């Protein structure tokens, strides 16, 4: 017979007719959400069937049929385990107990050079997950809008590569991590900043997106990306934090007209307006759950989980990826690599971007950082997390001791 | 029905009665090697069967299975095509077309400081496959035996670490690669060595393993561990690399001297006693094939891919490729791991041990070097390898553009 | 029988009368100046008591002794060769030779990296001494104007310790040479600039002078200052060479932020202001004859030679003294230490400042640098002049070889 | 009219016979020591004077004579005060204010590294003075001997250039003070070491004196070139610390192999023999007294003050009083320099060799040092001199403000 009800069978039990509630509540278990843009066909057929029989609230076989033919692909792989985390309810316990385990953490310093930082309570802790096939879940205040930071950094860096190629790019940056306490310097050897994660690097790659078209324009530019990236969820901007930001970084100022000085830039860059463009992507802003999404996107080789749209190619997404892994925590990249061995990337507003590659991406945030500019929440869940599950990119998929698996069944 | 006598309609295909080159023939061809230890009890049998009428010999559905009884599981998953990579012949393919791309590279110079490396024609060059369920392939000199050299440093370090485990052994060294030019600081900021894949690193970890017996059991100890690392191939020693390394040898000296002034190695250590045995362990020797295999073992979770044994541990195995990511490759580690993407170490005889997590291990070789030491071919091949599959460690496994996947079928 | 007669009849010779010119030959030949300030008043007088009967051109005993009345100690020791240099009419020979001898050093490029240097030819060549009594002499292009630049930093350094004293100065600024490559790096182990010699520790310098008034009180102050050190002679300013420099100078402004950035300037600076201040400074114009005589208050502890006039503390002359030993000749400092020893300090538009303590005072002029920055025929200079004279610092006064001490008589 | 007359009755009171007593006590005041080796034939007659017609002891005119004949050139400098400090009496009671008010210094930590120097009383304070003229003072501890450990170095540095010129010498050991803090380094830029006074570059010119001959041999030529600079006073031997030193020398044997794998050392180097060398040299025991003479032989242009005898060349004096300008007193050799602006060396056994050009040497003891490597008291004393004295390298020595003058009389 058919796919599409075959999956009726599958749902309907021995019975008839499925509840509309049933069904519902088999479809969130599998993790995906009732506003997933991939099934807007299916719940908006629901919907207006819901209506069209107050006479219900039950599914027949054709009934069925004429809601989830639209999107029956996605619809048959969700209903059959063919998700990359097939018990996905088991697994989300686990997180909110990372989450619990990590909440009890109380150290740290919220950063307040910027006025604006300080307006968040330490309280604040959220986790976001989206797996490569638009699972979701969340625990805390993951729903909370603060600034990326430094965590727009991958982000940008790979817009350059989609938009420029990985030749180009590092014309101009680096791709190494500069050494340990190997930190205060700007350049490298060939005069060029050591990698993207870096400010001075980062400032760097901020001047070759979109060049010759205005500030307005290249910050929207850029926010159209961000927004594909993030399955258009929450993608905002503080200028309370822009203005702040750019008052206040003379360091900043003081990497422009270095790298200005011994012609970083390329040919006829407008330095003081490309900081102003730095401080402006700093500024954006994410939830948990937005953020989750964009890092998804770079765990599901550039495509967007939750629309199924390319938005970036493979190639920027695997250069962002090695960069996130030994550049990506501030002088922590080192010792993160090691133990935690994921891509990562921290932003001073208590925001740590997580990638596992071919399985999810997430957000953790808290504003309270330790010693090296890290949120202290966001540090011990991923310590947490990998000595949980087998997800180090090193540990081995066959033989991986008293860890669990969420790839795989029971 | 069962397994085996199923097994033997496969290969039967229609005809009756299946001859034993036909048997052998259709082995051969999903990677297995007629010598495999796992395929030891059905070959004897087989060897066995070679005598009871020395004329044949045809295998009804009765002697086929009395045959492979004993492997069956194995020989059922060689030829359902279930193997980590299912069209090996293909893939051999391959890596054959990799290989003379390769060759025709002639830049480099053989290493000269020693007199036993000279002697090496500049036109060896060996690749060798095993993949973490015992396929095999070479191409070229690969049963040429050559000194480990540097290779031999994460070897050591798996070794230490599965005895002494992580904490302990990363008391006396670090774990991050060091900075911009540096193979010129002997210590980081606390006084231990930045990591085990740099001169003073592999020197205090020599003197962390089987302390209190003498260099003459330690030695014994280190063999039969690679032994086992190497499913029982070729490891041999070169007693006269081992004296032109030591007389001729003064930087080493320089290293151990500052260590031991420094108090890097542990309580009631005989430092010019450790030199004497790093430099044996420089001088163990290896094929291409043999140190495949090896690697093979740090790709399949420590467990080695053609006997069954566990090695390693999965702290050990998962140390080991961690730091070998970034540390690898001398001064091109960092330029290494984002274009490779791949765990590999290289040595000053030519020899790069590289490790394709999940999938396979790998020992490629050429004596002449690249100004920073690592073997020009060597460094061609790999390149090459990441450029036509998807084996970077940040490659995508669902979307990988115009990359091969010799994991997939279908 | 006493002063200003005996000084008459040791020039008369037992002639009749004293002709003017054969006065004025002798005085020019002890060194001094027919225009030396402290000589204003004799002068003066003569050539208005040539009008009380021009019908001379003699003079009575009783007509000189009128004359050299007022400055009689001063005439009386120039004539019984007291001076620091006895046989003047010597030392500017051999002042000369050494003159002609770099003369031939065609080497060197001129500074082209601002319209105002690249303006300069390359053929000009200019060196003028003033000893600590005043004895003068000048060779080659010696009232041609150019830039101080760099030769400044050691003036306004003065200037500041003379006003705030050697305690306070040193809160804002280092006392050492950096390190042979620390050529680099902005500020030392405790976030000051390493020394005032230097371009961080210069501009920190100037934020120090003269405080809480605007900068063109500031600058009138400094430019006062530096007339009273050169006997008023000429000090100019260069609008050309402010307005190039500060249109050029990324780099000076990338230290600017920096230095802002880990508050190195006393609280309540203008920092942008302190970058033009600073600018003004370098752009101040000299001749070699006005800023020898700088040089030579230096030399001669604070008093300016030529008028008298205590300038400088003896504090800040020794400080300054100290600084432009060690750290005066950019990277050639180290070797112009050993080989020259003697207080030096250059400049981008050609200038050597240099110093020998207690004896003289000079002023090196040739525009084409060497790839240090340092004046080619200036450098070769002082070279020369220290293997004839024991002016090496660390030459001994009663021992002193093949050399010559233009301080003895015979 | 003779000198030898003309002296006595200087000495007399207008009188008949001057007193024996009231002659010495006379001598004894210019500073000039009974023992004077110019002194000793003068000496020997007056204490056989004193024996023979002991009908005395009233010297007359050609009794005087008979004394004083034999050093008369001397002993009329002595009493005409035309020494290089004509009041000493006055002097002396300055330095024993200076030594008494470092008396109460008792900050620091004895060296504790071998048990040689454990064994030192903390409270042992010692100053000597010899002056260009052979004039003595010693007050505290003077008299026992120490080992001269680092303050060595400059010595076989003069050495070294003595023997084999600038241009040799400075093949193997640069010339400039390595970096303000780049101390760890052994080698610089161009693979030398960065000056004699540090480990590695008192190790490689250790390498180039007397090569060719045996220990024995080069160990006696050092001892005999000490013995002519300090007029032949004592030079001992600690052949107990030279035993603790070479045990216990890991870091010295770590600079050794480095610097003949880069190949510091001259062809033909047994660098093993050289270290133990070394360890001798720096085992080398002298007096505060003795080490006074040889320190004053630097100040002297190479001449020893009382013998009169030309030890070393003025290129080799002027070559060290430079270094030890620049790197005489480890680490704080810029803040020395700045402040004192005298060449010194320290050593780890608490000495201070200090060097005022053209006037005197000092030896100053004090076991406990700092957490720099420097006697407490040694440098609480240096500070003091200068504070008191124009001794500093660009004091004026015409206008200096309160500081006093001992060149000069009333
Ligand atoms: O460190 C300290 C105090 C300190 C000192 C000692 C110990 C611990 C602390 N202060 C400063 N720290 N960073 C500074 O950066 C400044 C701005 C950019 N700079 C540069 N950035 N990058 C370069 N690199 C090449 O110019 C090329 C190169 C050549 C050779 C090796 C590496 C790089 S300079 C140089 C100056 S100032
Ligand atoms: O406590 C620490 C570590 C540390 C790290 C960070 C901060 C604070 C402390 N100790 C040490 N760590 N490494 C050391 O090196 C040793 C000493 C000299 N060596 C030499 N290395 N290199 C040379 N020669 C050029 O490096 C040549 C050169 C090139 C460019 C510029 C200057 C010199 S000698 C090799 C051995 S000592």
Redesign the pocket.
Known sequence: PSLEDLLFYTIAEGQEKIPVHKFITALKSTGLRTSDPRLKECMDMLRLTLQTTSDGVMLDKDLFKKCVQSNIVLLTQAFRRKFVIPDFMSFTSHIDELYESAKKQSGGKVADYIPQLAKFSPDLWGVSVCTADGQRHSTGDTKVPFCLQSCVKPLKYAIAVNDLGTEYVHRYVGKEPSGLRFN??????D?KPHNPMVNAGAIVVTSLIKQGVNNAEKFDYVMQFLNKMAGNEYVGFSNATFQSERESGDRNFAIGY?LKEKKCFPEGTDMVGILDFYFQLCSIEVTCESASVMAATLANGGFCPITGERVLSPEAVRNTLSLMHSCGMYDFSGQFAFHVGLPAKSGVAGGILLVVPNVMGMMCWSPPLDKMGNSVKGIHFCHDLVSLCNFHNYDNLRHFAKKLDPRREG
């Open positions: 205060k310097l700007f350049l490298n050897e005069d270095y």
